Amino acid sequence: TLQSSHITEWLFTIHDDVKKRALECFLETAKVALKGRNKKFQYILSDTSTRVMEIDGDEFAEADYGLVVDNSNGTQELQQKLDTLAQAALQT
Amino acid sequence: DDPVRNKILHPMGGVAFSYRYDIWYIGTMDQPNIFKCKIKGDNEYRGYQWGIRNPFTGQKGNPYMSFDEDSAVIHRMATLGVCVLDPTRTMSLIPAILQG
């Protein structure tokens, strides 16, 4: 049924795009909520992550700083590539 | 007390509809006695019948013309009603100069 999944992959391909930008938009929305006197964001963010807000660049989008919300095939190989390297570093 | 709609004056000064006594709520019923009836959720019309432009919505250009005039006609229609389940829970007392 792979070649029938070729027929409907045109729906998923644009749907994987909307899931990218709805998380690119949510990440900018969450970035403004940090600078709004919110005691929750000190619980879900670390020491060094709660200090990035004081640098004068947190108003712009993360696409202008070299960061994208990427679910592609390259980042899933890299996520495995750091894991099989981790176990092969565990032994030895 | 309204002198615009109530037009019969009473001989003892003022309008005659203001001398009417009405007891709208008598006791406890365990439901609304008087309520407003309304179909499928308020349903209302906001039609528009316009020619080469629409002054109402502010639109020049019509791909599907209503007529060829330089006009705009608005149509609005609504259906509505009131209910009294128990009219014995309401007692009126009306002056007779208003004629029944």
């Binding site: - | 709609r5 309520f35 179909i39 499928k40 009131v82």
Partner: protein, 50 residues
């Protein structure tokens, strides 16, 4: 007149053209008399004995 008609609640109806509500009375009732008869089948008048 508008703020008079705002104190009354609302009820959505499923369209249709008319509404009915059912009103109920009491189950207990006293029944009038037509006439009483004695043992031999004749009626009891007003000017009769016990």
């Amino acid at each position: 007149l508008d703020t008079f008609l705002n104190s009354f609640p609302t009820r959505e109806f499923e369209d249709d053209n008319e509404y009915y509500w059912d009103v109920i009375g009491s189950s207990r009732r006293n029944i009038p008399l037509v006439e009483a008869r004695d043992e031999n089948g004749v009626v009891v008048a007003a000017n009769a004995a016990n």
